[PDB]
Structures are given as structure tokens and as C-alpha cells.
Amino acid sequence: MEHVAFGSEDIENTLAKMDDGQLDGLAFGAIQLDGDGNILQYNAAEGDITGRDPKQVIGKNFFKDVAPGTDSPEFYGKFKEGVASGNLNTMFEWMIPTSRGPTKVKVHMKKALSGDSYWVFVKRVKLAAALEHHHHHH
Numbered sequence: 001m002e003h004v005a006f007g008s009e010d011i012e013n014t015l016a017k018m019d020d021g022q023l024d025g026l027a028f029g030a031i032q033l034d035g036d037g038n039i040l041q042y043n044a045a046e047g048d049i050t051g052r053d054p055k056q057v058i059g060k061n062f063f064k065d066v067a068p069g070t071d072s073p074e075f076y077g078k079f080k081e082g083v084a085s086g087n088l089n090t091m092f093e094w095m096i097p098t099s100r101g102p103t104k105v106k107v108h109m110k111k112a113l114s115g116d117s118y119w120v121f122v123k124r125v126k127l128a129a130a131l132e133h134h135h136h137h138h
């Protein structure tokens with residue numbers, strides 16, 4: 001009846017009942033990974049922004065092709081980290097380097113309700129500028 005909300009208290013409960021059709025309707029990115037990190041689900045929204053295909057990512061790991069070079073303890077490490085505890089709950093910002101240039105965004109990974117899957121949402125942050133903070137060598 002109501003619309004979906006990013007980082008909602010019942011975001012998983014809602015999506016669990018919703019299918020791929022509605023998922024793509026979302027105004028944000030949604031990616032479901034398995035215990036190993038294999039792309040189980042992929043909403044069109046994210047596929048459009050990033051430029052990746054859902055039926056093409058299916059089976060492939062998020063750090064395998066979906067994100068080459070993301071095999072760090074900050075991203076990949078956290079993913080498997082929570083999996084060991086049985087509740088991958090992490091919320092931080094990530095940099096998505098593209099052809100047009102790097103752009104900061106919001107990343108949220110919450111383990112599914114069934115436990116045999118993990119939800120990964122992504123929302124582009126607001127526009128903003130920045131400067132350099134370099135000093136003389138010491």
C-alpha cells in the first residue's frame with residue numbers, strides 16, 4: 001500500500017514480500033548478496049546508475065565483477081565479517097569511481113530476514129565541493 005523507505009525499520013520485511021518488479025521501481029540501488037557474496041538479486045535502478053546488468057551479475061560476486069578492487073577489509077571484510085556473526089549490519093559511505101569521475105555515496109548492508117541472504121542498498125549523497133589538505137613534507 002505505502003511506498004518503500006531507505007533504511008526503514010521494516011525495509012527487509014517489505015522487500016521480502018516484494019518482487020523484482022517493484023524493486024526496480026525504487027528510487028535507489030538494491031543488491032542482494034549471498035553468504036559468499038554472490039549477486040543473488042539486482043534492481044534495475046542500480047543497474048542503470050552503475051551501468052550493470054542484473055541477469056548478467058547473477059552468480060557473480062559483488063567484489064568479483066560488480067566492483068573490481070573492492071576486495072578490502074573495509075568493504076569485503078565487513079561483508080564476510082558480519083556473515084560470521086549472523087547479522088551483517090554496516091552503514092558507511094563509499095566512493096564509486098566512474099568514467100565521468102568519482103562520486104561519494106551512501107552504503108547500507110543488512111542481513112536478510114531468512115538469514116540465507118544479505119541486502120545491500122546504495123543511495124547517492126547530496127552534491128558538495130571540497131579542497132586539498134596537503135602540507136610541506138616532514
Ligand SMILES: COc1cc(O)ccc1/C=C1N=C(/C=C/c2ccncc2)N(C)C\1=O
Nearest residue numbers: 046050066067068069070094095096097107
Ligand atoms: C557500493 O559500491 C558499488 C556499487 C555498485 O552498484 C557498483 C560499483 C560499486 C563500487 C565500485 N566499483 C568500482 C569499479 C567499477 C568498474 C566497472 C567497470 N569497469 C571498471 C571498473 N570500484 C573501484 C568500486 O569501488
